[PDB]
Symmetry: C3
Subunit: 214 residues, 3 copies
């Protein structure tokens, strides 16, 4: 079977190409930067911290964060839980957003080709890692790392808000982000809002690349 | 120009339906159901259920199913799980008793209909779109899930309420069945839901025929 | 006559259902619900991990060759009916399965509706059951046993740290649709789907190899 071996080798070479590109790529942010910025302001009210974190992010990384007139809270229904996001930055390999919920929810965390860090500004974050029978609760200031290829169970109490950074192959999350919209909530207006904010963030990153070149 | 023509055609359809819903006669109204439920909100929710059903059959004869056509049917939707007892249902109205004996919550749905819920017992947490804070509602209060808006709903164990919906009722069907098709696989409950809805529609049609002749 | 074709389909499905029902009524089983319930309640006073170990030991002694070995035991996430838990499969055939189930988070949802009877004996935590057609639920504690009967559908809810021993008997294939739906249409965690298929393949092959060893 020459063609099946060619398919195996070709899919392997595509994976190898993306993996080597992700290892040798320059990034705008890093998980430690976002985590420390969020932990520094985790002692305030989460709204005050939201404002301060957005201001600091726009100061240190101009042209990589959406403006105030492009920021809106969009519901996120995924993995059986329901939260809300405010997207600040998004490329093909990075994204920064404000995430959280005003209700008690929980479910599957997803399993993607990306590493996702969450630093709690308020509330509680229960993580139940795969292969164990016990979970751990995290509090404001802490940082949870949803590692690459790993799947956990997440649970948040009412009023839990955090700053989120994802790095890796971001498209590998879209299916997880849309399943509950297609097969449960049927809230396609929220789907439109999500597509709109992510289109805006991608266009911002493209315009910044063009502005850097000229 | 073809796309503008498509937009205009759907707009003319929307205005025709919207003007029909605004100038249509209705059997109930959301304020009537809300006041009736709040009047009995101080008693036990089951006893209040009985009194509310009797009062509705008195004020609106021929528009409410009889006792042998009332049954509790599970409702799995938007990630939450409750139960309903349908009392009335047409193409533009429905009245039911809703609630849950477990702690659940999820997406409220987004339809072309206005849905009001008056709590008989328990707690009702509503989280409106675009905000970072939610609110808890108690027996006697009424939540209005307005047309086109989406919220997050959450109910504690033992939460029961009286619900009235007005608008384009078919626009909710998909939501009410999604979790049954793609999660629970409880097609017997799907049959129960289709059955109770068919009974309510047939009651409304036969009542219209009897009033006309 | 099209009515003849519809009656032929109905009658054929009826004879198939009767054939499976009669096979299930005259079949020999490895376990029974009372055995698993009493064994779990006997160790329900200990920590759930210690009870897990003791229950597995007793089960492997009383039914050798029908339970997977230690290197074939792994915790696999179970997303179904809107809830999320975890399983450790010990035994599984086409008509029986024994596993350890539970959750370390607060979850709940639809219990499912299959052609099988499923029993759960609580080792720790709380188990809230809401039966169909009623407006009240009941909470059950370690030592109690919940029976998810054939054809019934309930709402289940578990508090964080709730663990139990589960036995199912009936037509096990009738559960696959429920057991995988949330993975296909929500979590997209196909690696967990692979883990589930792997452990079930191991249990089925163990039962087949045990029958072959008994025959020769
Ligand atoms: O909005 C999000 O983030 C929620 C994640 N939460 C919950 C689980 O734990 C980490 C934080 C996600 C997203 C939203 C929109 C587009 C693409 C992705 C990103 C990661 C998880 C899926 C949804
Ligand atoms: O069964 C219901 O009622 C839930 C009400 N809950 C949940 C949604 O938000 C308000 C409270 C609904 C229904 C079921 C079946 C047919 C037509 C409608 C009515 C609208 C809301 C979802 C589905
Ligand atoms: O993992 C399980 O068993 C815990 C079930 N629970 C929870 C609800 O109440 C009864 C016990 C099930 C399974 C998982 C995977 C394959 C085949 C079956 C068995 C039937 C019910 C859920 C899915
Ligand atoms: C619906 C089930 C409610 C369980 C008890 C909640 C007690 C109050 O809980 C509070 O409710 C507020 C309003 O949503 C939230 O803003 C707070 O974050 C939450 O702590």
């Amino acid at each position: 079977g020459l063609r099946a071996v060619l398919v195996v080798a070709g899919l392997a070479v595509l994976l190898q190409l993306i993996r080597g590109w992700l290892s040798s790529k320059s990034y705008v942010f890093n998980r430690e930067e976002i985590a420390r910025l969020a932990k520094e302001h985790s002692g305030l009210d989460y709204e005050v911290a939201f404002s301060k974190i957005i201001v600091e992010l726009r100061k240190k990384h101009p042209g990589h964060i959406l403006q105030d007139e492009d920021l809106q809270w969009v519901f996120v229904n995924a993995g059986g839980w329901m939260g809300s996001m405010c997207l600040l930055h998004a490329s093909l390999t990075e994204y920064v957003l404000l995430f959280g919920t005003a209700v008690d929810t929980g479910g599957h965390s997803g399993r993607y080709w990306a590493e996702i860090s969450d630093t709690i500004l308020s509330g509680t974050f229960r993580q139940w890692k795969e292969g164990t029978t016990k979970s751990e609760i995290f509090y404001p200031g802490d940082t949870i790392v949803h590692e690459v290829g790993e799947a956990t169970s997440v649970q948040w109490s009412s009023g839990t808000w955090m700053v989120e950074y994802g790095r890796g192959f971001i498209p590998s999350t879209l299916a997880f982000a849309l399943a509950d919209t297609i097969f449960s909530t049927q809230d396609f207006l929220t789907l439109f809002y999500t597509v709109k904010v992510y289109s805006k963030a991608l266009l911002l990153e493209a315009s910044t690349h063009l502005s850097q070149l000229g």
